[PDB]
Design a binder for this molecule. Structure first.
Ligand SMILES: [Cl-]
Ligand SMILES: [Cl-]
Lengths: 109, 101
């Protein structure tokens, strides 16, 4: 049998993508990190979706992605939304939490 | 106007990030403008088209990550010989933000 790690499906494609990221961002990736591991996992599964011509779950999985990557910004967005609901007394589309999260990420760097 | 509301929202941000926002900075201006658009869309009960809106937000706020995501998507398309949907550029951008920053 062939070890899974030795099934070299798209190994050189993956390496090309990483080189593009490293050149463009002018850094070296941390192959140890959760962010890198999840990036590679995302790419591997995106390859599968592309091969099968599958769409994605546009709204809902964006939420969880941001909750996992930027929990402080994500939860802060929801705290702002809580206050908006309490004062303005209108419903809030969860897309607003996505926008707020993205606007918060740069603030404390 | 929502002046007191805005001040409370900024206080929450400051607490959560354990920082004080410089009120005499582009940082504060950008923040308050975005928040005011959120308020306006909530009050007027106006939905967004999240796919198109996110592409616009990312292009303008995360140009390096977004443009790099598009380069990667083009490589994937050309290698796999399949269509790639615009939403993929969005999801890939969101995975790149924490790599770059
Ligand atoms: Cl965070
Ligand atoms: Cl909703």
């Amino acid at each position: 049998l062939r070890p899974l790690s030795e099934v070299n499906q798209h190994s050189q494609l993956m390496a090309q993508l990483v080189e593009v990221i490293e050149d463009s961002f002018q850094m070296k990736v941390n192959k140890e990190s959760v962010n890198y591991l999840r990036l590679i996992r995302h790419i591997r599964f995106t390859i599968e979706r592309i091969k099968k011509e599958e769409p994605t779950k546009e709204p809902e999985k964006l939420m969880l992605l941001l909750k996992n990557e930027y929990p402080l910004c994500y939860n802060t967005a929801w705290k702002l939304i809580k206050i908006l609901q309490q004062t303005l007394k209108k419903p809030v589309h969860e897309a607003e939490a996505v926008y707020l999260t993205l606007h918060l990420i740069p603030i404390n760097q």
